[PDB]
Structures are given as C-alpha cells and as structure tokens.
Amino acid sequence: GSSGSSGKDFLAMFSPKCGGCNRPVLENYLSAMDTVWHPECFVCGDCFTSFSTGSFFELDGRPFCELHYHHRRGSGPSSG
C-alpha cells in the first residue's frame, strides 16, 4: 500500500523561440519585439506577406505591413 513517482522532463532550454511555431531558433533567425522569429513565419497578420521588401512595423506587439499597419492606425480601432 504505497505509490509514488518523481522525475519528469520539463523545458530543458532557455534560448528564445520563434513567435509563431515556438521553436528554438539558432541559424537564420530574426530579432523583433525583444524576441526572436523565423525568416518564414515572421509575416503580416492580415495580408500575411513577407517583410523582405522593406522594414516591418510593430502595432500592439504584432507584425504588420505598412499597407495594413497604416490602415489600422487610421480607419479602425487603435490604442495609445
């Protein structure tokens, strides 16, 4: 009449992870919003376009493209 069990495998990694797949980025990784991302995931939220052409924009901690990024700021709900 005695049971018990200890010893599990928890997050054994401190390094950051893409803000989309939650994977440990090492090579060919980006650094946005004080975090890391993937050169394939890091894209807009609406049009979901790559940020290769130019630079991206941070809107409430979310990757967006000038096109939308701006549209949202104006005609639409926005906070300051």
| List 18, 36, 51, 56, residue binding Zn ion (CB under 5 A) | 18
| List 15, 24, 68, 75, residue binding Zn ion (CB under 5 A) | 68
| List 32, 41, 59, 62, residue binding Zn ion (CB under 5 A) | 41
Could you give the 3-state DSSP secondary structure of residue 24? coil
Distance from CA of residue 30 to its chain's centroid? 10
Give the type of residue at 31. Answer: S
Q: Does 44 bind Zn ion (CB under 5 A)?
A: yes
- Ramachandran area for residue 49 (φ above 0: left; ψ -120 to 50: alpha; else beta): beta
Residues forming contacts to Zn ion in the complex (CB under 5 A) are 18, 20-21, 38, 41, 44, 46-47, 65, 68
